[PDB]
């Protein structure tokens, strides 16, 4: 068994995972290899390479992927949208009145004919 495979398995075990599947650590190692290769190539094309080139390459890469993670207060997680824009959209939506329903239609009405699966056979 290679090195850092035992370390990744120990890290997973120390976080609640009671069982694994043999091949996960290999996947993670190959992913790390590919990420390192991509970032290195980008930095080499940017500019011997300094730390500024590496930082610029990472910043450029962050523009179209890795928009996730467990970020909290003002952390770019769950898509990366800003809370003010979402609040504006929520204010716009939550301004309309709730639909009017009668007891004879409570549970039997459906959307218009344009938004239902009618005649798909």
């Amino acid at each position: 068994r290679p090195r850092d495979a035992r370390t990744l398995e120990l890290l997973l075990t120390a976080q609640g995972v009671t069982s694994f599947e043999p091949r996960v650590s290999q996947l993670l190692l190959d992913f790390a290899y590919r990420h390192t290769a991509a970032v290195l190539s980008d930095a080499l094309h940017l500019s011997s390479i300094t730390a500024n080139a590496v930082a610029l390459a990472i910043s450029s890469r962050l523009g179209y992927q890795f928009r996730g993670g467990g970020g909290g207060y003002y952390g770019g997680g769950g898509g990366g949208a800003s809370k003010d824009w979402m609040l504006e959209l929520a204010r716009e939506r939550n301004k309309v009145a709730l639909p009017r329903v009668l007891p004879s239609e409570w549970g039997v009405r459906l959307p218009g004919e344009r938004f239902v699966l009618s005649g798909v056979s």
Binding site: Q15, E21, A53, I58, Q65
Partner: protein, 75 residues
């Protein structure tokens, strides 16, 4: 800087594959970035695992995690 779980020697080998010589500072920065990305992937995979009422991690969860982050799939 902080203490790194990822050994910079892996980054050094990757650089050697591409015929590149690195100083200490960019090496450390790349190691830190790789560590952060691994942490992000683990967080996403555990989220997907917990969503399914399970305690066993499978390759499908890791693939879904990689998909939500816009990373090229591994086959």
């Amino acid at each position: 800087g902080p203490k790194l779980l990822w050994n910079p020697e892996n980054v050094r080998d990757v650089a050697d594959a591409l015929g590149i010589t690195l100083s200490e500072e960019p090496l450390r920065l790349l190691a830190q970035d790789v560590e952060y990305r691994i942490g992000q992937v683990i967080v996403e995979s555990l989220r997907f695992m917990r969503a399914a009422n399970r305690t066993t991690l499978t390759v499908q969860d890791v693939s879904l995690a990689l998909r939500v982050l816009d990373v090229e799939p591994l086959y």
